[PDB]
């Protein structure tokens, strides 16, 4: 039995996403067919977005038709589930600066018409400005101390007014000694001067330690 989750485009195999490319697995994940309609396993130990959803995040904003700027796409594992979610009329702009990871992303996009690989450094969005059109959501998982400044720069460049951000923050990646709680609070403090308004925060439960997701609205 597979049923729709509260989040549109997300499903619960009593977590899964509807396969944009039936019969194909991206990174070895298993799938289930319901009669005709194929779904792919979405693992919360592997995907911070899956973990947040299981952990009861109120909004993810990534939904059918959404245009998503994805910072830190890596090889495309979570990106592939985002691609399923946004569907044929949505888009996933997958920013990754590793050329090796880039190769897997590029190969992934060959099979998935809604993924746009962007193999560039997210710190310099002016360099890839022509490749990206305004987006509805920024999802960020770059694991960098300056991630908040990165998201802000990308927001001013690409995120529509009223658009949202979903930001994965590994505390010990910003400051290895500080309490996670103090790290989260410091990051959230930085957002006011960019007109980024946090709306919720949650930590990623048993899947990831001292790891928060912050969801908010930009230029509301
Ligand atoms: C899913 S893990 C974190 C990913 O973010 C990527 N990343 C880190 N810094 C940057 C940057 N400045 N621009 C683009 N991707 C980055 C890393 O190469 C890794 O694949
Ligand atoms: Ca296309
Ligand atoms: Ca600034």
XYZ file of N, CA and C and ligand atoms in Angstrom:
682
model
N 0.853 -1.221 0.000
C 0.000 0.000 0.000
C 0.875 1.251 0.000
N 0.610 2.143 -0.953
C 1.274 3.453 -1.022
C 0.193 4.518 -0.972
N 0.360 5.492 -0.092
C -0.609 6.577 -0.005
C 0.076 7.941 -0.030
N -0.673 8.996 -0.424
C -0.110 10.342 -0.440
C 0.226 10.824 0.959
N 1.407 11.413 1.088
C 1.815 12.082 2.300
C 1.146 13.471 2.336
N 1.126 14.092 3.514
C 0.683 15.491 3.657
C 1.362 16.441 2.641
N 2.663 16.252 2.409
C 3.383 17.005 1.374
C 3.097 16.453 -0.039
N 2.518 17.301 -0.898
C 2.179 16.951 -2.279
C 3.443 16.485 -2.996
N 3.317 15.405 -3.759
C 4.449 14.807 -4.460
C 5.227 13.832 -3.596
N 4.903 13.766 -2.309
C 5.544 12.817 -1.420
C 4.550 11.723 -1.074
N 5.062 10.506 -0.926
C 4.217 9.367 -0.640
C 4.761 8.528 0.512
N 3.873 7.767 1.131
C 4.246 6.925 2.251
C 3.860 5.476 1.938
N 4.872 4.614 1.814
C 4.692 3.174 1.578
C 4.324 2.559 2.931
N 3.249 3.118 3.497
C 2.570 2.703 4.744
C 3.456 2.559 5.990
N 8.996 6.275 3.409
C 8.821 7.391 2.485
C 9.201 6.954 1.069
N 8.411 7.372 0.081
C 8.731 7.113 -1.326
C 8.385 8.316 -2.212
N 8.971 8.361 -3.403
C 8.587 9.357 -4.409
C 8.182 8.658 -5.700
N 7.274 9.260 -6.463
C 6.836 8.640 -7.717
C 7.961 8.729 -8.753
N 8.361 7.588 -9.328
C 9.490 7.572 -10.257
C 9.211 8.336 -11.554
N 9.987 9.390 -11.784
C 9.891 10.181 -12.998
C 10.328 9.340 -14.194
N 11.151 8.328 -13.927
C 11.704 7.446 -14.969
C 11.453 5.973 -14.587
N 10.210 5.482 -14.764
C 9.878 4.105 -14.359
C 10.868 3.065 -14.885
N 11.174 2.073 -14.052
C 12.129 1.017 -14.396
C 13.598 1.329 -14.151
N 13.911 2.594 -13.835
C 15.300 3.052 -13.578
C 15.525 3.356 -12.104
N 16.614 2.831 -11.549
C 17.104 3.271 -10.243
C 18.328 4.161 -10.401
N 18.418 5.165 -9.543
C 19.471 6.160 -9.619
C 20.750 5.759 -8.894
N 20.610 5.296 -7.651
C 21.756 4.976 -6.812
C 21.579 3.631 -6.135
N 20.797 2.752 -6.771
C 20.579 1.381 -6.280
C 19.345 1.187 -5.421
N 18.604 2.264 -5.185
C 17.397 2.207 -4.344
C 16.374 1.274 -4.975
N 15.606 0.609 -4.115
C 14.568 -0.313 -4.562
C 13.287 0.440 -4.885
N 12.434 -0.208 -5.661
C 11.151 0.374 -5.955
C 10.020 -0.633 -5.913
N 8.810 -0.088 -5.861
C 7.568 -0.841 -5.755
C 6.612 -0.321 -6.825
N 5.899 -1.243 -7.466
C 4.873 -0.897 -8.442
C 3.491 -1.188 -7.865
N 2.568 -0.264 -8.104
C 1.201 -0.349 -7.621
C 0.264 -0.291 -8.834
N -0.628 -1.269 -8.961
C -1.581 -1.272 -10.072
C -2.970 -0.859 -9.597
N 1.864 -0.609 -12.455
C 1.374 0.513 -13.236
C 2.059 1.814 -12.803
N 1.961 2.150 -11.511
C 2.615 3.344 -10.941
C 3.774 2.925 -10.044
N 4.973 3.365 -10.398
C 6.180 2.953 -9.688
C 6.674 4.032 -8.723
N 7.051 3.602 -7.513
C 7.617 4.512 -6.511
C 9.030 4.074 -6.113
N 9.878 5.032 -5.740
C 11.240 4.723 -5.297
C 11.387 4.965 -3.804
N 12.046 4.027 -3.120
C 12.442 4.200 -1.717
C 13.239 5.484 -1.530
N 12.914 6.230 -0.475
C 13.615 7.471 -0.152
C 14.137 7.386 1.279
N 15.440 7.159 1.400
C 16.049 6.804 2.680
C 16.435 7.995 3.565
N 15.862 8.074 4.786
C 16.162 9.207 5.672
C 17.574 9.197 6.281
N 18.263 8.057 6.259
C 19.661 8.053 6.675
C 20.559 8.665 5.599
N 20.090 8.649 4.355
C 20.871 9.147 3.231
C 20.519 10.588 2.841
N 19.248 10.964 3.010
C 18.719 12.252 2.547
C 18.238 13.111 3.713
N 18.847 14.285 3.875
C 18.460 15.221 4.959
C 17.017 15.684 4.775
N 16.568 15.787 3.529
C 15.197 16.197 3.263
C 14.208 15.114 3.700
N 14.483 13.859 3.344
C 13.685 12.735 3.886
C 13.622 12.723 5.431
N 14.763 12.942 6.084
C 14.842 12.967 7.558
C 13.935 14.056 8.144
N 13.978 15.230 7.523
C 13.169 16.379 7.971
C 11.694 16.062 7.864
N 11.299 15.474 6.734
C 9.912 15.095 6.499
C 9.459 14.094 7.569
N 10.211 13.003 7.757
C 9.862 12.045 8.818
C 9.816 12.699 10.191
N 10.708 13.656 10.402
C 10.760 14.391 11.659
C 9.672 15.428 11.876
N 8.799 15.600 10.892
C 7.597 16.415 11.056
C 7.749 17.889 10.696
N 8.724 18.218 9.862
C 8.816 19.577 9.290
C 7.439 20.007 8.731
N 7.007 21.234 9.037
C 5.690 21.717 8.614
C 5.577 21.932 7.104
N 6.583 22.583 6.515
C 6.578 22.908 5.080
C 7.904 22.527 4.472
N 7.867 22.049 3.232
C 9.101 21.843 2.472
C 9.159 22.699 1.207
N 8.003 23.192 0.749
C 7.874 24.070 -0.425
C 8.214 23.425 -1.790
N 9.077 22.421 -1.776
C 9.356 21.595 -2.951
C 8.094 20.755 -3.187
N 7.471 20.950 -4.337
C 6.158 20.365 -4.641
C 5.979 20.298 -6.165
N 4.977 19.533 -6.655
C 4.841 19.496 -8.113
C 4.832 20.885 -8.760
N 5.590 21.007 -9.841
C 5.709 22.257 -10.608
C 6.741 23.261 -10.091
N 7.250 23.054 -8.877
C 8.184 24.003 -8.269
C 9.489 24.093 -9.057
N 10.064 25.291 -9.098
C 11.407 25.478 -9.652
C 12.372 25.598 -8.451
N 13.330 24.678 -8.376
C 14.176 24.529 -7.184
C 15.646 24.745 -7.537
N 16.295 25.635 -6.792
C 17.728 25.820 -6.888
C 18.331 25.010 -5.757
N 19.051 23.964 -6.147
C 19.622 23.015 -5.188
C 21.141 23.215 -5.046
N 21.558 23.767 -3.904
C 22.976 24.049 -3.624
C 23.628 22.885 -2.870
N 24.640 22.277 -3.496
C 25.336 21.108 -2.935
C 24.711 19.809 -3.416
N 24.506 19.702 -4.731
C 23.801 18.570 -5.342
C 24.551 17.217 -5.266
N 25.867 17.270 -5.049
C 26.701 16.053 -4.986
C 26.429 15.197 -6.233
N 26.259 13.888 -6.072
C 26.041 12.974 -7.202
C 24.577 12.920 -7.666
N 23.693 13.537 -6.880
C 22.292 13.619 -7.249
C 21.292 12.715 -6.552
N 21.675 12.082 -5.442
C 20.748 11.180 -4.748
C 19.475 11.898 -4.225
N 19.629 12.918 -3.370
C 18.450 13.694 -2.944
C 17.859 14.460 -4.126
N 18.722 15.021 -4.979
C 18.248 15.695 -6.197
C 17.285 14.821 -7.008
N 17.594 13.530 -7.146
C 16.692 12.654 -7.865
C 15.290 12.600 -7.262
N 15.179 12.597 -5.936
C 13.863 12.633 -5.262
C 13.181 13.983 -5.401
N 13.958 15.049 -5.310
C 13.416 16.368 -5.632
C 12.851 16.419 -7.087
N 13.618 15.900 -8.052
C 13.182 15.768 -9.439
C 11.840 15.000 -9.551
N 11.704 13.862 -8.854
C 10.434 13.127 -8.823
C 9.313 14.052 -8.335
N 9.594 14.736 -7.238
C 8.565 15.549 -6.557
C 8.071 16.665 -7.474
N 9.005 17.428 -8.046
C 8.628 18.594 -8.859
C 7.984 18.161 -10.194
N 8.360 16.981 -10.681
C 7.674 16.393 -11.830
C 7.995 17.049 -13.167
N 7.241 16.671 -14.225
C 7.577 17.075 -15.581
C 7.594 18.575 -15.782
N 6.772 19.298 -15.033
C 6.649 20.751 -15.218
C 7.481 21.547 -14.211
N 8.171 20.863 -13.303
C 9.054 21.545 -12.345
C 10.474 21.523 -12.853
N 11.388 22.123 -12.094
C 12.798 22.111 -12.440
C 13.677 21.967 -11.209
N 14.784 21.246 -11.378
C 15.807 21.202 -10.332
C 17.144 21.688 -10.902
N 17.578 22.869 -10.464
C 18.889 23.383 -10.839
C 19.898 22.849 -9.827
N 20.792 21.979 -10.285
C 21.635 21.227 -9.361
C 23.061 21.769 -9.385
N 23.361 22.611 -8.388
C 24.662 23.265 -8.272
C 25.615 22.392 -7.440
N 26.746 22.037 -8.038
C 27.762 21.221 -7.364
C 29.132 21.628 -7.919
N 30.103 21.921 -7.065
C 31.389 22.349 -7.636
C 32.425 21.259 -7.881
N 32.173 20.054 -7.351
C 33.040 18.901 -7.601
C 32.824 18.375 -9.013
N 33.885 18.344 -9.808
C 33.742 17.815 -11.168
C 33.438 16.329 -11.193
N 34.011 15.579 -10.251
C 33.699 14.158 -10.144
C 32.221 13.942 -9.819
N 31.720 14.608 -8.774
C 30.294 14.523 -8.464
C 29.499 15.007 -9.666
N 29.985 16.089 -10.276
C 29.402 16.670 -11.475
C 29.112 15.669 -12.575
N 30.019 14.716 -12.772
C 29.836 13.699 -13.814
C 28.601 12.825 -13.586
N 28.349 12.459 -12.327
C 27.180 11.682 -11.985
C 25.941 12.538 -12.180
N 26.008 13.812 -11.788
C 24.869 14.718 -11.981
C 24.497 14.851 -13.448
N 25.511 15.055 -14.287
C 25.327 15.259 -15.721
C 24.681 14.016 -16.330
N 25.199 12.846 -15.966
C 24.595 11.574 -16.396
C 23.153 11.368 -15.942
N 22.883 11.782 -14.703
C 21.540 11.775 -14.182
C 20.574 12.633 -15.000
N 20.986 13.864 -15.310
C 20.196 14.809 -16.114
C 19.883 14.272 -17.530
N 20.796 13.468 -18.088
C 20.516 12.796 -19.376
C 19.205 11.993 -19.347
N 18.864 11.413 -18.193
C 17.667 10.595 -18.045
C 16.446 11.345 -17.512
N 16.696 12.521 -16.934
C 15.683 13.300 -16.231
C 15.645 14.713 -16.809
N 14.608 14.977 -17.602
C 14.505 16.214 -18.373
C 14.350 17.463 -17.489
N 13.964 17.254 -16.226
C 13.754 18.391 -15.305
C 14.969 18.740 -14.397
N 16.116 18.120 -14.645
C 17.334 18.475 -13.926
C 18.288 19.269 -14.799
N 18.715 20.416 -14.280
C 19.704 21.240 -14.968
C 21.004 21.240 -14.147
N 22.017 20.481 -14.609
C 23.298 20.483 -13.892
C 24.032 21.811 -14.005
N 24.526 22.292 -12.876
C 25.287 23.520 -12.826
C 26.567 23.244 -12.045
N 27.645 22.987 -12.776
C 28.872 22.512 -12.161
C 29.762 23.724 -11.926
N 29.430 24.449 -10.861
C 30.040 25.727 -10.550
C 30.058 25.917 -9.050
N 30.802 26.933 -8.623
C 30.970 27.279 -7.235
C 29.847 28.207 -6.834
N 29.048 27.747 -5.876
C 27.868 28.470 -5.382
C 28.188 29.805 -4.730
N 29.475 30.059 -4.477
C 29.909 31.318 -3.880
C 29.911 32.460 -4.877
N 29.884 32.115 -6.164
C 29.914 33.090 -7.236
C 28.749 32.935 -8.239
N 27.501 33.234 -7.796
C 26.324 33.007 -8.644
C 26.310 33.874 -9.898
N 26.992 35.014 -9.864
C 27.089 35.860 -11.047
C 27.707 35.099 -12.213
N 28.509 34.076 -11.917
C 29.182 33.308 -12.970
C 28.266 32.339 -13.705
N 27.177 31.930 -13.058
C 26.211 31.040 -13.700
C 24.838 31.683 -13.835
N 24.791 33.015 -13.817
C 23.513 33.735 -13.859
C 22.680 33.403 -15.097
N 23.324 33.262 -16.260
C 22.592 32.980 -17.495
C 21.994 31.573 -17.557
N 22.515 30.652 -16.751
C 22.096 29.260 -16.838
C 20.827 29.005 -16.009
N 20.516 29.937 -15.104
C 19.433 29.775 -14.129
C 18.378 30.881 -14.233
N 17.111 30.480 -14.274
C 15.981 31.420 -14.261
C 15.438 31.511 -12.811
N 14.711 32.567 -12.474
C 14.171 32.692 -11.105
C 13.500 31.400 -10.596
N 13.754 31.086 -9.334
C 13.277 29.840 -8.740
C 12.284 30.142 -7.624
N 11.484 29.135 -7.293
C 10.533 29.192 -6.168
C 11.154 28.834 -4.816
N 12.194 27.995 -4.839
C 12.791 27.494 -3.605
C 14.285 27.376 -3.755
N 15.008 27.729 -2.693
C 16.400 27.301 -2.575
C 16.508 26.212 -1.516
N 17.058 25.064 -1.898
C 17.431 24.032 -0.933
C 18.951 24.010 -0.865
N 19.500 24.121 0.343
C 20.955 24.216 0.522
C 21.527 23.191 1.509
N 22.520 22.444 1.039
C 23.190 21.436 1.857
C 24.660 21.391 1.408
N 25.370 22.503 1.566
C 26.767 22.590 1.074
C 27.810 22.280 2.146
N 27.370 22.225 3.401
C 28.259 21.861 4.521
C 29.507 22.760 4.568
N 29.274 24.069 4.600
C 30.341 25.063 4.551
C 30.060 26.067 5.650
N 31.122 26.598 6.287
C 30.917 27.568 7.363
C 30.178 28.820 6.883
N 30.383 29.181 5.618
C 29.795 30.398 5.053
C 28.497 30.128 4.263
N 27.857 28.981 4.530
C 26.636 28.573 3.824
C 25.542 29.632 3.864
N 25.386 30.309 4.994
C 24.313 31.307 5.087
C 24.525 32.482 4.133
N 25.770 32.941 4.034
C 26.155 33.975 3.092
C 25.981 33.462 1.653
N 26.331 32.201 1.423
C 26.086 31.558 0.113
C 24.607 31.564 -0.287
N 23.742 31.136 0.627
C 22.298 31.101 0.376
C 21.778 32.505 0.096
N 22.217 33.476 0.911
C 21.808 34.881 0.752
C 22.182 35.402 -0.626
N 23.424 35.150 -1.054
C 23.871 35.618 -2.364
C 23.021 34.987 -3.475
N 22.768 33.690 -3.358
C 21.919 32.994 -4.343
C 20.462 33.463 -4.309
N 19.986 33.798 -3.116
C 18.627 34.308 -2.971
C 18.481 35.638 -3.689
N 19.370 36.599 -3.393
C 19.287 37.904 -4.079
C 19.356 37.786 -5.605
N 20.135 36.826 -6.091
C 20.275 36.600 -7.519
C 19.087 35.859 -8.144
N 18.622 34.789 -7.496
C 17.694 33.852 -8.162
C 16.335 33.599 -7.503
N 16.200 33.858 -6.205
C 14.956 33.446 -5.538
C 13.857 34.491 -5.699
N 12.688 34.055 -6.140
C 11.575 34.991 -6.383
C 11.113 35.602 -5.045
N 10.511 36.790 -5.102
C 9.833 37.359 -3.936
C 8.804 36.356 -3.405
N 8.775 36.140 -2.093
C 7.790 35.210 -1.505
C 8.281 33.772 -1.613
N 9.429 33.599 -2.274
C 10.055 32.285 -2.407
C 10.554 31.784 -1.065
N 10.866 30.498 -0.990
C 11.309 29.926 0.280
C 12.689 29.314 0.241
N 13.302 29.196 1.415
C 14.593 28.488 1.542
C 14.449 27.350 2.553
N 15.159 26.265 2.264
C 15.204 25.096 3.119
C 16.705 24.799 3.275
N 17.211 24.985 4.480
C 18.641 24.995 4.667
C 19.061 23.932 5.678
N 19.900 23.010 5.229
C 20.482 22.004 6.105
C 21.766 22.560 6.764
N 21.814 22.547 8.096
C 22.958 23.100 8.847
C 23.539 22.052 9.801
N 24.747 21.593 9.502
C 25.441 20.657 10.374
C 26.244 21.540 11.288
N 25.847 21.579 12.557
C 26.467 22.511 13.491
C 27.988 22.431 13.469
N 28.537 21.221 13.565
C 29.989 21.066 13.709
C 30.773 21.415 12.436
N 30.033 21.732 11.378
C 30.611 22.212 10.136
C 30.787 23.744 10.127
N 29.959 24.452 10.898
C 30.090 25.909 11.073
C 31.100 26.226 12.180
N 30.957 25.550 13.323
C 31.858 25.702 14.470
C 31.935 24.387 15.256
N 33.089 23.725 15.190
C 33.275 22.392 15.787
C 33.215 22.311 17.326
N 33.473 23.427 18.004
C 33.501 23.454 19.480
C 32.176 23.886 20.117
N 31.512 24.846 19.467
C 30.303 25.478 19.996
C 29.142 24.498 20.133
N 28.197 24.823 21.021
C 26.972 24.044 21.172
C 26.181 24.224 19.884
N 25.576 23.138 19.419
C 24.774 23.141 18.195
C 23.721 24.238 18.254
N 23.022 24.310 19.387
C 21.961 25.293 19.612
C 22.451 26.735 19.386
N 23.653 27.035 19.871
C 24.250 28.350 19.691
C 24.613 28.573 18.223
N 25.042 27.500 17.555
C 25.365 27.565 16.125
C 24.126 27.873 15.300
N 23.041 27.137 15.544
C 21.786 27.373 14.836
C 21.310 28.816 15.020
N 21.339 29.285 16.267
C 20.914 30.638 16.611
C 21.749 31.725 15.917
N 23.053 31.494 15.785
C 23.953 32.448 15.142
C 23.624 32.555 13.646
N 23.380 31.398 13.030
C 23.067 31.346 11.610
C 21.759 32.072 11.320
N 20.743 31.776 12.122
C 19.436 32.409 12.020
C 19.546 33.938 12.200
N 20.436 34.375 13.093
C 20.665 35.812 13.330
C 21.132 36.558 12.069
N 21.973 35.897 11.264
C 22.529 36.450 10.025
C 21.474 36.782 8.955
N 20.285 36.207 9.085
C 19.306 36.217 7.990
C 18.517 37.508 7.883
N 18.357 38.186 9.021
C 17.546 39.396 9.084
C 18.000 40.461 8.084
N 19.311 40.655 7.964
C 19.850 41.695 7.088
C 19.754 41.362 5.596
N 19.290 40.154 5.292
C 19.083 39.734 3.918
C 17.586 39.626 3.593
N 16.735 40.061 4.534
C 15.286 39.862 4.456
C 14.932 38.388 4.212
N 15.677 37.508 4.873
C 15.349 36.077 4.958
C 14.714 35.873 6.326
N 13.474 35.387 6.347
C 12.725 35.251 7.591
C 12.489 33.763 7.895
N 13.212 33.221 8.880
C 12.974 31.827 9.297
C 11.556 31.624 9.818
N 10.935 30.513 9.432
C 9.566 30.217 9.851
C 9.491 28.966 10.721
N 10.414 28.035 10.498
C 10.517 26.889 11.401
C 11.941 26.338 11.419
N 12.258 25.585 12.475
C 13.544 24.923 12.599
C 13.277 23.573 13.265
N 13.967 22.535 12.816
C 13.911 21.253 13.524
C 15.233 20.548 13.361
N 15.534 19.640 14.274
C 16.751 18.880 14.167
C 16.400 17.521 13.597
N 17.415 16.813 13.121
C 17.197 15.640 12.288
C 17.291 14.311 13.035
N 16.860 14.345 14.300
C 16.395 13.151 15.046
C 17.434 12.089 15.077
N 17.020 10.797 14.983
C 18.132 9.893 15.183
C 18.999 9.773 13.938
N 18.466 10.179 12.778
C 19.201 10.055 11.498
C 20.518 10.822 11.450
N 20.494 12.056 11.948
C 21.677 12.917 11.939
C 21.784 13.661 13.265
N 23.000 13.731 13.811
C 23.249 14.322 15.139
C 23.561 15.822 15.015
N 22.966 16.644 15.890
C 23.242 18.080 15.912
C 23.201 18.677 14.490
N 22.080 18.433 13.835
C 21.897 18.805 12.449
C 20.509 19.382 12.310
N 20.421 20.659 11.929
C 19.123 21.304 11.824
C 18.729 21.539 10.373
N 17.428 21.638 10.152
C 16.895 22.188 8.918
C 16.115 23.447 9.312
N 16.435 24.551 8.641
C 15.722 25.824 8.814
C 14.954 26.144 7.528
N 13.655 26.398 7.683
C 12.753 26.694 6.566
C 12.254 28.121 6.760
N 12.241 28.900 5.679
C 11.809 30.290 5.778
C 11.439 30.901 4.440
N 11.053 32.176 4.512
C 10.557 32.954 3.365
C 11.478 34.163 3.089
N 11.676 34.444 1.806
C 12.563 35.503 1.357
C 11.731 36.598 0.708
N 11.974 37.851 1.079
C 11.204 38.983 0.536
C 9.675 38.721 0.446
N 9.033 38.382 1.590
C 7.616 38.011 1.631
C 6.711 39.197 1.314
C 25.634 16.495 -0.184
S 27.197 16.975 0.453
C 27.870 18.597 0.279
C 28.118 18.947 -1.191
O 28.236 20.368 -1.338
C 29.274 20.655 -2.277
N 29.850 22.015 -2.117
C 30.622 22.488 -1.108
N 30.976 23.787 -1.324
C 30.425 24.153 -2.502
C 30.391 25.375 -3.341
N 31.047 26.499 -2.961
N 29.680 25.325 -4.491
C 29.022 24.227 -4.907
N 29.014 23.073 -4.204
C 29.687 22.983 -3.018
C 30.302 19.547 -2.051
O 31.174 19.334 -3.182
C 29.411 18.350 -1.734
O 29.108 17.615 -2.925
Ca 14.326 19.483 -20.223
Ca 26.339 40.421 3.108
